[PDB]
PDB file of C-alpha atoms in Angstrom:
ATOM      1  CA  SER A   1      19.607 -59.096-103.492  1.00 17.62           C
ATOM      2  CA  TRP A   2      21.649 -61.723-101.724  1.00 16.02           C
ATOM      3  CA  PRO A   3      21.376 -65.403-101.027  1.00 16.59           C
ATOM      4  CA  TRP A   4      19.963 -66.071 -97.559  1.00 15.33           C
TER       5      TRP A   4
ATOM      6  CA  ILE B   1      15.457 -63.582 -88.682  1.00 14.93           C
ATOM      7  CA  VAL B   2      15.083 -59.852 -88.089  1.00 11.68           C
ATOM      8  CA  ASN B   3      12.421 -58.912 -85.497  1.00 12.43           C
ATOM      9  CA  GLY B   4      11.539 -62.434 -84.547  1.00  8.73           C
ATOM     10  CA  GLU B   5      11.530 -64.014 -81.138  1.00  8.10           C
ATOM     11  CA  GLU B   6      13.121 -66.905 -79.376  1.00  9.41           C
ATOM     12  CA  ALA B   7      11.456 -70.278 -79.938  1.00 12.52           C
ATOM     13  CA  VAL B   8      10.385 -72.655 -77.217  1.00 10.57           C
ATOM     14  CA  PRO B   9      13.246 -75.168 -77.085  1.00 11.59           C
ATOM     15  CA  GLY B  10      12.516 -78.291 -79.073  1.00 13.43           C
ATOM     16  CA  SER B  11       9.277 -76.962 -80.558  1.00 14.35           C
ATOM     17  CA  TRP B  12      10.492 -77.004 -84.200  1.00 19.72           C
ATOM     18  CA  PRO B  13      11.894 -80.524 -84.143  1.00 16.69           C
ATOM     19  CA  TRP B  14      12.582 -80.795 -87.889  1.00 16.46           C
ATOM     20  CA  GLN B  15      14.886 -77.744 -87.858  1.00 16.52           C
ATOM     21  CA  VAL B  16      18.536 -78.641 -88.401  1.00 16.06           C
ATOM     22  CA  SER B  17      21.710 -76.593 -88.591  1.00 16.07           C
ATOM     23  CA  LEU B  18      24.249 -77.205 -91.342  1.00 14.53           C
ATOM     24  CA  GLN B  19      27.758 -76.665 -90.035  1.00 11.86           C
ATOM     25  CA  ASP B  20      31.103 -76.826 -91.735  1.00 13.36           C
ATOM     26  CA  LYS B  21      34.062 -78.697 -90.296  1.00 10.65           C
ATOM     27  CA  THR B  22      35.073 -75.652 -88.225  1.00  9.44           C
ATOM     28  CA  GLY B  23      31.711 -75.695 -86.431  1.00 11.70           C
ATOM     29  CA  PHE B  24      30.361 -72.643 -88.269  1.00 12.04           C
ATOM     30  CA  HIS B  25      26.586 -72.580 -88.919  1.00 12.32           C
ATOM     31  CA  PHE B  26      26.014 -71.561 -92.512  1.00 15.86           C
ATOM     32  CA  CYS B  27      22.475 -72.731 -93.425  1.00 11.94           C
ATOM     33  CA  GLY B  28      19.366 -74.369 -92.066  1.00 12.29           C
ATOM     34  CA  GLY B  29      17.456 -77.404 -93.248  1.00 13.33           C
ATOM     35  CA  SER B  30      14.477 -79.592 -92.391  1.00 11.96           C
ATOM     36  CA  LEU B  31      14.210 -83.292 -91.622  1.00 11.25           C
ATOM     37  CA  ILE B  32      11.613 -85.003 -93.811  1.00 14.33           C
ATOM     38  CA  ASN B  33      12.262 -88.515 -92.404  1.00  9.68           C
ATOM     39  CA  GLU B  34      15.059 -90.184 -90.440  1.00  6.58           C
ATOM     40  CA  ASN B  35      17.390 -90.404 -93.429  1.00  7.16           C
ATOM     41  CA  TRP B  36      16.808 -87.219 -95.452  1.00  8.30           C
ATOM     42  CA  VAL B  37      17.161 -83.459 -95.031  1.00  9.33           C
ATOM     43  CA  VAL B  38      15.806 -80.750 -97.357  1.00  6.76           C
ATOM     44  CA  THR B  39      17.811 -77.554 -97.743  1.00  8.60           C
ATOM     45  CA  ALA B  40      18.563 -74.886-100.376  1.00  9.23           C
ATOM     46  CA  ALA B  41      20.758 -75.763-103.345  1.00 10.26           C
ATOM     47  CA  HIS B  42      22.616 -72.469-103.064  1.00  9.14           C
ATOM     48  CA  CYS B  43      23.867 -73.453 -99.601  1.00  9.14           C
ATOM     49  CA  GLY B  44      26.553 -75.458-101.398  1.00  8.80           C
ATOM     50  CA  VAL B  45      26.595 -78.375 -99.002  1.00 11.20           C
ATOM     51  CA  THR B  46      29.263 -81.026 -99.427  1.00 10.53           C
ATOM     52  CA  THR B  47      29.859 -84.393 -97.803  1.00 11.90           C
ATOM     53  CA  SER B  48      32.386 -82.674 -95.479  1.00  8.34           C
ATOM     54  CA  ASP B  49      29.635 -80.661 -93.797  1.00  9.47           C
ATOM     55  CA  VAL B  50      27.628 -81.847 -90.775  1.00  7.54           C
ATOM     56  CA  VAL B  51      23.883 -81.884 -90.040  1.00  8.57           C
ATOM     57  CA  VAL B  52      23.101 -80.967 -86.437  1.00  9.84           C
ATOM     58  CA  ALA B  53      19.700 -82.092 -85.145  1.00  7.87           C
ATOM     59  CA  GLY B  54      18.067 -81.444 -81.798  1.00  8.88           C
ATOM     60  CA  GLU B  55      19.770 -78.107 -81.188  1.00  8.26           C
ATOM     61  CA  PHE B  56      18.330 -75.008 -79.572  1.00  7.69           C
ATOM     62  CA  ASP B  57      21.270 -72.985 -78.221  1.00  5.00           C
ATOM     63  CA  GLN B  58      24.413 -73.164 -80.333  1.00  5.84           C
ATOM     64  CA  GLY B  59      26.353 -71.811 -77.318  1.00  8.40           C
ATOM     65  CA  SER B  60      25.397 -74.682 -75.011  1.00  8.45           C
ATOM     66  CA  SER B  61      27.606 -77.722 -74.322  1.00  9.08           C
ATOM     67  CA  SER B  62      24.836 -79.530 -72.427  1.00  9.49           C
ATOM     68  CA  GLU B  63      22.236 -80.208 -75.145  1.00  7.99           C
ATOM     69  CA  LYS B  64      21.795 -83.737 -76.399  1.00  7.76           C
ATOM     70  CA  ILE B  65      22.372 -82.985 -80.043  1.00  4.40           C
ATOM     71  CA  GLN B  66      22.920 -85.355 -82.923  1.00  6.09           C
ATOM     72  CA  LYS B  67      25.754 -84.642 -85.334  1.00  4.76           C
ATOM     73  CA  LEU B  68      24.972 -86.538 -88.506  1.00  5.03           C
ATOM     74  CA  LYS B  69      27.241 -87.214 -91.446  1.00  5.84           C
ATOM     75  CA  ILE B  70      26.129 -86.708 -95.024  1.00  3.97           C
ATOM     76  CA  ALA B  71      26.386 -89.616 -97.472  1.00  5.13           C
ATOM     77  CA  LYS B  72      25.367 -87.868-100.673  1.00  4.08           C
ATOM     78  CA  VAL B  73      24.195 -84.478-101.882  1.00  2.00           C
ATOM     79  CA  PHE B  74      21.337 -84.425-104.425  1.00  2.24           C
ATOM     80  CA  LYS B  75      21.099 -81.011-106.004  1.00  2.00           C
ATOM     81  CA  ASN B  76      17.933 -80.651-108.056  1.00  2.00           C
ATOM     82  CA  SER B  77      18.891 -80.886-111.744  1.00  2.00           C
ATOM     83  CA  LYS B  78      16.616 -77.924-112.509  1.00  2.35           C
ATOM     84  CA  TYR B  79      18.491 -75.605-110.117  1.00  2.00           C
ATOM     85  CA  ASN B  80      19.595 -72.476-111.945  1.00  2.00           C
ATOM     86  CA  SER B  81      22.432 -70.704-110.120  1.00  2.09           C
ATOM     87  CA  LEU B  82      22.079 -67.604-112.277  1.00  2.00           C
ATOM     88  CA  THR B  83      18.495 -66.915-111.185  1.00  2.00           C
ATOM     89  CA  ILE B  84      18.486 -68.971-107.965  1.00  2.00           C
ATOM     90  CA  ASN B  85      15.408 -70.781-109.237  1.00  2.00           C
ATOM     91  CA  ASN B  86      14.475 -74.339-108.143  1.00  2.00           C
ATOM     92  CA  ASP B  87      16.613 -73.767-105.039  1.00  3.10           C
ATOM     93  CA  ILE B  88      16.440 -77.195-103.376  1.00  3.71           C
ATOM     94  CA  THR B  89      18.900 -79.907-102.390  1.00  6.81           C
ATOM     95  CA  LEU B  90      18.314 -83.208-100.631  1.00  6.09           C
ATOM     96  CA  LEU B  91      20.890 -84.631 -98.239  1.00  4.91           C
ATOM     97  CA  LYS B  92      20.958 -88.368 -97.654  1.00  2.00           C
ATOM     98  CA  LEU B  93      22.365 -89.032 -94.201  1.00  2.00           C
ATOM     99  CA  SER B  94      25.026 -91.657 -93.592  1.00  2.00           C
ATOM    100  CA  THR B  95      23.609 -92.320 -90.153  1.00  2.00           C
ATOM    101  CA  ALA B  96      19.877 -92.072 -89.493  1.00  2.00           C
ATOM    102  CA  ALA B  97      18.570 -89.483 -87.116  1.00  2.00           C
ATOM    103  CA  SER B  98      17.059 -90.871 -83.940  1.00  2.00           C
ATOM    104  CA  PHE B  99      13.596 -89.384 -83.582  1.00  2.00           C
ATOM    105  CA  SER B 100      12.569 -88.195 -80.158  1.00  2.00           C
ATOM    106  CA  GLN B 101      10.636 -85.415 -78.495  1.00  2.00           C
ATOM    107  CA  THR B 102      13.055 -82.861 -79.994  1.00  4.23           C
ATOM    108  CA  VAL B 103      13.838 -84.494 -83.375  1.00  6.18           C
ATOM    109  CA  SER B 104      11.117 -85.420 -85.883  1.00  6.78           C
ATOM    110  CA  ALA B 105       9.897 -84.699 -89.417  1.00  9.21           C
ATOM    111  CA  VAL B 106       7.969 -81.949 -91.129  1.00  8.73           C
ATOM    112  CA  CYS B 107       5.183 -82.841 -93.585  1.00  9.69           C
ATOM    113  CA  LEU B 108       5.489 -82.298 -97.307  1.00 10.20           C
ATOM    114  CA  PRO B 109       2.578 -80.924 -99.322  1.00  7.23           C
ATOM    115  CA  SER B 110       0.905 -82.515-102.304  1.00  6.11           C
ATOM    116  CA  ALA B 111       1.824 -80.866-105.621  1.00  7.68           C
ATOM    117  CA  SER B 112      -1.767 -79.629-105.923  1.00  6.32           C
ATOM    118  CA  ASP B 113      -2.058 -78.099-102.433  1.00  8.58           C
ATOM    119  CA  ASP B 114      -3.105 -74.458-102.228  1.00  9.96           C
ATOM    120  CA  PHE B 115      -1.611 -71.987 -99.739  1.00  9.67           C
ATOM    121  CA  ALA B 116      -3.430 -68.701-100.242  1.00  9.82           C
ATOM    122  CA  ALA B 117      -1.933 -65.215-100.149  1.00  7.51           C
ATOM    123  CA  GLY B 118      -2.619 -63.729 -96.723  1.00  9.18           C
ATOM    124  CA  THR B 119      -2.194 -66.990 -94.856  1.00  7.40           C
ATOM    125  CA  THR B 120       0.028 -66.602 -91.798  1.00  7.41           C
ATOM    126  CA  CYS B 121       2.901 -69.081 -91.710  1.00  8.91           C
ATOM    127  CA  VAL B 122       6.089 -69.420 -89.654  1.00  4.79           C
ATOM    128  CA  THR B 123       9.792 -69.405 -90.447  1.00  8.67           C
ATOM    129  CA  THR B 124      12.626 -70.414 -88.132  1.00  6.63           C
ATOM    130  CA  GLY B 125      16.400 -70.263 -88.047  1.00  5.97           C
ATOM    131  CA  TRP B 126      19.693 -69.034 -86.662  1.00  3.99           C
ATOM    132  CA  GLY B 127      20.217 -66.331 -89.292  1.00  3.45           C
ATOM    133  CA  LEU B 128      21.215 -62.778 -88.490  1.00  3.54           C
ATOM    134  CA  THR B 129      18.880 -60.792 -86.277  1.00  4.08           C
ATOM    135  CA  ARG B 130      20.222 -57.474 -87.548  1.00  2.95           C
ATOM    136  CA  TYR B 131      22.120 -56.473 -90.656  1.00  2.00           C
TER     137      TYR B 131
ATOM    138  CA  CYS C   1       4.872 -85.821 -89.623  1.00  2.77           C
ATOM    139  CA  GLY C   2       4.241 -82.242 -88.670  1.00  3.51           C
ATOM    140  CA  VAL C   3       3.051 -82.572 -85.073  1.00  2.10           C
ATOM    141  CA  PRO C   4       5.734 -81.542 -82.575  1.00  2.00           C
ATOM    142  CA  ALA C   5       5.858 -83.246 -79.181  1.00  2.00           C
ATOM    143  CA  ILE C   6       6.688 -79.863 -77.630  1.00  2.34           C
ATOM    144  CA  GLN C   7       4.119 -77.407 -78.849  1.00  2.00           C
ATOM    145  CA  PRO C   8       5.346 -74.127 -80.321  1.00  2.00           C
ATOM    146  CA  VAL C   9       4.160 -70.892 -78.761  1.00  2.00           C
ATOM    147  CA  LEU C  10       3.805 -67.961 -81.175  1.00  2.00           C
TER     148      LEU C  10
ATOM    149  CA  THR D   3      24.148 -64.074 -85.131  1.00  2.00           C
ATOM    150  CA  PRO D   4      21.919 -65.450 -82.358  1.00  2.00           C
ATOM    151  CA  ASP D   5      22.863 -68.509 -80.284  1.00  2.00           C
ATOM    152  CA  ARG D   6      19.226 -69.465 -79.764  1.00  2.00           C
ATOM    153  CA  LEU D   7      16.735 -70.545 -82.419  1.00  2.00           C
ATOM    154  CA  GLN D   8      14.429 -67.765 -83.607  1.00  2.00           C
ATOM    155  CA  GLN D   9      10.941 -67.838 -85.067  1.00  2.00           C
ATOM    156  CA  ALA D  10       8.611 -65.383 -86.757  1.00  2.00           C
ATOM    157  CA  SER D  11       5.127 -65.471 -88.166  1.00  2.00           C
ATOM    158  CA  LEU D  12       4.573 -63.796 -91.526  1.00  2.00           C
ATOM    159  CA  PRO D  13       2.067 -63.760 -94.376  1.00  2.00           C
ATOM    160  CA  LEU D  14       2.282 -65.359 -97.783  1.00  2.00           C
ATOM    161  CA  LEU D  15       2.096 -63.063-100.819  1.00  2.00           C
ATOM    162  CA  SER D  16       0.956 -63.844-104.373  1.00  2.00           C
ATOM    163  CA  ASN D  17       3.670 -63.938-107.062  1.00  2.00           C
ATOM    164  CA  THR D  18       1.871 -61.182-108.973  1.00  2.00           C
ATOM    165  CA  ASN D  19       2.093 -58.871-105.969  1.00  2.00           C
ATOM    166  CA  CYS D  20       5.645 -59.983-105.146  1.00  2.00           C
ATOM    167  CA  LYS D  21       6.652 -58.844-108.667  1.00  2.00           C
ATOM    168  CA  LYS D  22       5.855 -55.265-107.635  1.00  2.00           C
ATOM    169  CA  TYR D  23       8.972 -55.522-105.398  1.00  2.00           C
ATOM    170  CA  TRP D  24      11.213 -57.902-107.351  1.00  2.00           C
ATOM    171  CA  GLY D  25      10.088 -57.761-110.967  1.00  2.00           C
ATOM    172  CA  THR D  26      11.126 -60.535-113.313  1.00  2.00           C
ATOM    173  CA  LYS D  27      13.370 -62.110-110.656  1.00  2.00           C
ATOM    174  CA  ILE D  28      10.275 -63.960-109.361  1.00  2.00           C
ATOM    175  CA  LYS D  29       9.749 -67.337-111.060  1.00  2.00           C
ATOM    176  CA  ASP D  30       6.974 -69.939-110.691  1.00  2.00           C
ATOM    177  CA  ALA D  31       9.156 -72.101-108.353  1.00  2.00           C
ATOM    178  CA  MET D  32       9.388 -69.218-105.891  1.00  2.00           C
ATOM    179  CA  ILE D  33       6.938 -68.014-103.236  1.00  2.00           C
ATOM    180  CA  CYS D  34       7.202 -64.728-101.366  1.00  2.00           C
ATOM    181  CA  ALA D  35       6.416 -64.067 -97.722  1.00  2.00           C
ATOM    182  CA  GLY D  36       6.860 -61.217 -95.284  1.00  2.00           C
ATOM    183  CA  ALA D  37       7.007 -57.485 -95.897  1.00  2.00           C
ATOM    184  CA  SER D  38       5.235 -57.459 -92.540  1.00  2.00           C
ATOM    185  CA  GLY D  39       7.824 -56.170 -90.068  1.00  2.00           C
ATOM    186  CA  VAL D  40       9.985 -59.315 -89.995  1.00  2.00           C
ATOM    187  CA  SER D  41      12.468 -60.803 -92.439  1.00  2.00           C
ATOM    188  CA  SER D  42      14.507 -63.905 -92.944  1.00  2.00           C
ATOM    189  CA  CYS D  43      18.186 -63.038 -93.300  1.00  2.00           C
ATOM    190  CA  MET D  44      21.656 -64.390 -94.041  1.00  2.00           C
ATOM    191  CA  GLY D  45      22.141 -67.732 -92.317  1.00  2.00           C
ATOM    192  CA  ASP D  46      18.433 -68.603 -92.443  1.00  2.00           C
ATOM    193  CA  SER D  47      18.835 -69.997 -95.971  1.00  2.00           C
ATOM    194  CA  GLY D  48      17.763 -73.577 -96.428  1.00  2.00           C
ATOM    195  CA  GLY D  49      15.476 -73.561 -93.413  1.00  2.00           C
ATOM    196  CA  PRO D  50      11.711 -73.905 -93.335  1.00  2.00           C
ATOM    197  CA  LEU D  51       8.673 -71.800 -94.060  1.00  2.00           C
ATOM    198  CA  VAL D  52       5.854 -73.909 -92.582  1.00  2.00           C
ATOM    199  CA  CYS D  53       2.091 -73.470 -92.648  1.00  2.00           C
ATOM    200  CA  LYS D  54      -0.426 -75.429 -90.599  1.00  2.00           C
ATOM    201  CA  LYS D  55      -2.837 -77.547 -92.734  1.00  2.00           C
ATOM    202  CA  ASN D  56      -5.327 -79.964 -91.210  1.00  2.00           C
ATOM    203  CA  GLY D  57      -3.539 -79.688 -87.842  1.00  2.00           C
ATOM    204  CA  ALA D  58      -0.014 -80.447 -89.127  1.00  2.00           C
ATOM    205  CA  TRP D  59       2.884 -78.233 -90.029  1.00  2.00           C
ATOM    206  CA  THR D  60       3.663 -78.519 -93.714  1.00  2.00           C
ATOM    207  CA  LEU D  61       6.761 -77.333 -95.560  1.00  2.00           C
ATOM    208  CA  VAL D  62       5.639 -74.638 -97.990  1.00  2.00           C
ATOM    209  CA  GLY D  63       8.916 -72.830 -98.593  1.00  2.00           C
ATOM    210  CA  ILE D  64      12.673 -73.102 -98.238  1.00  2.00           C
ATOM    211  CA  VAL D  65      14.424 -69.862 -97.269  1.00  2.00           C
ATOM    212  CA  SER D  66      16.200 -68.739-100.427  1.00  2.00           C
ATOM    213  CA  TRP D  67      16.998 -65.128-101.051  1.00  2.00           C
ATOM    214  CA  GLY D  68      15.591 -61.385-100.466  1.00  2.00           C
ATOM    215  CA  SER D  69      17.079 -58.115 -99.709  1.00  2.00           C
ATOM    216  CA  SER D  70      20.783 -57.736 -99.080  1.00  2.00           C
ATOM    217  CA  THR D  71      19.911 -55.685 -95.933  1.00  2.00           C
ATOM    218  CA  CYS D  72      17.061 -57.958 -94.718  1.00  2.00           C
ATOM    219  CA  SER D  73      14.568 -55.098 -94.953  1.00  2.00           C
ATOM    220  CA  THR D  74      11.399 -55.836 -93.012  1.00  2.00           C
ATOM    221  CA  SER D  75       9.222 -53.983 -95.501  1.00  2.00           C
ATOM    222  CA  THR D  76      10.330 -56.092 -98.504  1.00  2.00           C
ATOM    223  CA  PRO D  77       9.202 -59.685 -99.053  1.00  2.00           C
ATOM    224  CA  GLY D  78      11.553 -62.568 -98.715  1.00  2.00           C
ATOM    225  CA  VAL D  79      11.763 -65.188-101.419  1.00  2.00           C
ATOM    226  CA  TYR D  80      11.435 -68.887-100.706  1.00  2.00           C
ATOM    227  CA  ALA D  81      11.652 -71.964-102.911  1.00  2.00           C
ATOM    228  CA  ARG D  82       8.057 -73.101-103.536  1.00  2.00           C
ATOM    229  CA  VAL D  83       7.865 -76.670-102.277  1.00  2.00           C
ATOM    230  CA  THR D  84       4.683 -77.609-104.154  1.00  2.00           C
ATOM    231  CA  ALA D  85       6.614 -77.025-107.409  1.00  2.00           C
ATOM    232  CA  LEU D  86       9.457 -79.249-106.195  1.00  2.00           C
ATOM    233  CA  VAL D  87       7.813 -82.084-104.309  1.00  2.00           C
ATOM    234  CA  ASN D  88       7.477 -84.437-107.253  1.00  2.00           C
ATOM    235  CA  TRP D  89      11.282 -84.304-107.616  1.00  2.00           C
ATOM    236  CA  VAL D  90      11.647 -84.959-103.883  1.00  2.00           C
ATOM    237  CA  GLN D  91       9.429 -88.013-104.143  1.00  2.00           C
ATOM    238  CA  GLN D  92      11.214 -89.337-107.261  1.00  2.00           C
ATOM    239  CA  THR D  93      14.606 -88.908-105.528  1.00  2.00           C
ATOM    240  CA  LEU D  94      13.567 -90.681-102.353  1.00  2.00           C
ATOM    241  CA  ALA D  95      12.004 -93.562-104.323  1.00  2.00           C
ATOM    242  CA  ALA D  96      15.136 -94.135-106.402  1.00  2.00           C
ATOM    243  CA  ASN D  97      17.726 -93.867-103.530  1.00  2.00           C
TER     244      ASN D  97
END
């Protein structure tokens, strides 16, 4: 996951 | 947005771009009134960043955009950076936005409003179109 | 709030 | 990145169903949307997820986080504005  | 399409210019008039001092777009946000923008807490906005309202094409020099300074950053006290929960920040603008055909506010829901699974909604932005 | 002057086309 | 503003329509999911993708990472102040052939992606963060209610566009989510590759078959995760709006109202009233 990754911040968007 | 991956596999989206180009918007009609001006048709999402609450959408703002958050830019750093170099002019780099790093996050979106939404106007909720002339003085306040909602964005994500994890965007890490500071008072050195700029809110750009009224923009469609970030490559154009001819759009009548508003570059608005930020007075204060209000990160929600419940934001948890470890889990990215409660991911909301309010920005109080130093200079009010001037509302127009291309700049205006989105509505906020009531706390008790219901948005059912399966409802079709819309998202907008200048994020990557391909990874 | 919530009613754009320029209508979106989806 | 694109110069011009993009849009996409996409469906809301329930948190119970979103947990099939993301497990215990999904909290009550999150709402999932997508897995429908589109995805929000890096640089969209902070922007709106809006739904039309009684003829007006209403802010339901704030683009937050999702797949590191912006997979169009995985749901994106948005901050759930109904869980947060009381704080918004308290902040505006006090400032």
